[PDB]
């Protein structure tokens, strides 16, 4: 706290308290007593614990039927209203579309949709497997993720 | 009909000394008493007991001989502050009191 270490006044003498600095951590414009530094927050969770968490999240979606399975789902033009109206007449609300392999048109068909994410096969995570209400799963990706989870 | 005077430069005791004797009187006597009291709060209160009768005859259409003072109260204004030079080092700032004087004259 920019100043200098000089006292305000000498210690004994005039009838006040024993002041110590112009950077005094109980003063106005003083310091902070336990100020914290630029830090990190990532913890570490195991390979076994992470895959056990994935096997735990892959069960209540079955017991509650928020996971549904579809073989083919795509479009043949980079246009987002086609997926919008496809989900409209398919009558779903909040979908996590996980493809099996690379797709460019359907990945170009989420950049204005809010309750839609065109997820890849591998890149799933056990908080976006609860944050989305309903979810599909393709048979190009079922074995691609079960070879991971073993 | 009421009248105010705010930031009148006197203190909230030496203005209340004049206006504890024109609370319950008639406004014929409550001008001659404020002439014939020798303070400065007599002037600071007679000017607004003048410019309340001269604003209840204009913006109310009331008379003069019908009136009677029913309530008069003072509030305490805010003060500027300047320093007085003490000796053997010290200094002292002094608070210079200002007043809000209010007159409330009614009819019946």
């Amino acid at each position: 706290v920019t100043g200098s270490g000089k006292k305000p006044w000498r210690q004994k003498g005039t009838g006040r308290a024993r002041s110590g600095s112009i950077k005094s951590p109980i003063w106005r414009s003083g310091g902070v007593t336990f100020a914290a530094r630029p830090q990190d927050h990532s913890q570490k969770v195991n390979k076994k614990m992470y895959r056990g968490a994935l096997k735990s999240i892959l069960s209540e979606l079955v017991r509650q039927d928020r996971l549904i399975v579809v073989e083919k789902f795509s479009v043949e033009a980079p246009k987002t209203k086609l997926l919008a109206q496809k989900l409209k007449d398919m009558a779903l609300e909040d979908v996590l579309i996980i493809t099996g392999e690379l797709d460019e048109n359907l990945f170009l068909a989420a950049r204005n949709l809010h309750k839609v994410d065109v997820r890849d096969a591998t890149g799933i995570d056990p908080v976006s497997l609860i944050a989305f209400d309903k979810v599909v799963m393709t048979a190009d990706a079922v074995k691609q993720v079960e070879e991971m989870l073993a | 009909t009421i009248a105010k005077h705010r930031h009148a430069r006197s203190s909230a005791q030496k203005v209340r000394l004049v206006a504890d004797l024109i609370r319950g009187k008639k406004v014929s006597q409550a001008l001659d008493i404020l002439t014939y009291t020798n303070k400065k709060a007599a002037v600071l209160v007679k000017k607004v007991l003048e410019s309340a009768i001269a604003n209840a005859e204009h913006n109310d259409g009331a008379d003069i001989d019908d009136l009677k003072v029913t309530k008069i109260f003072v509030d305490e204004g805010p003060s500027m502050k300047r320093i007085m030079p003490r000796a053997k080092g010290r200094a002292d700032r002094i608070l210079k009191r200002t007043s809000h004087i209010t007159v409330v004259v009614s009819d019946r």
Binding site: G13, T14, G15 | M80, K81, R82, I83, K88, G89, R90, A91, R93
Partner: peptide
């Protein structure tokens, strides 16, 4: 004319209460 009525309130950065030399108890 117009007003501007906030000027100064300084403690002048000067000294304080004094001391004593009126010797107290001391004997024997």
């Amino acid at each position: 004319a117009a007003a501007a009525a906030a000027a100064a309130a300084a403690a002048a950065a000067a000294a304080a209460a004094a001391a004593a030399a009126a010797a107290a108890a001391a004997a024997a």
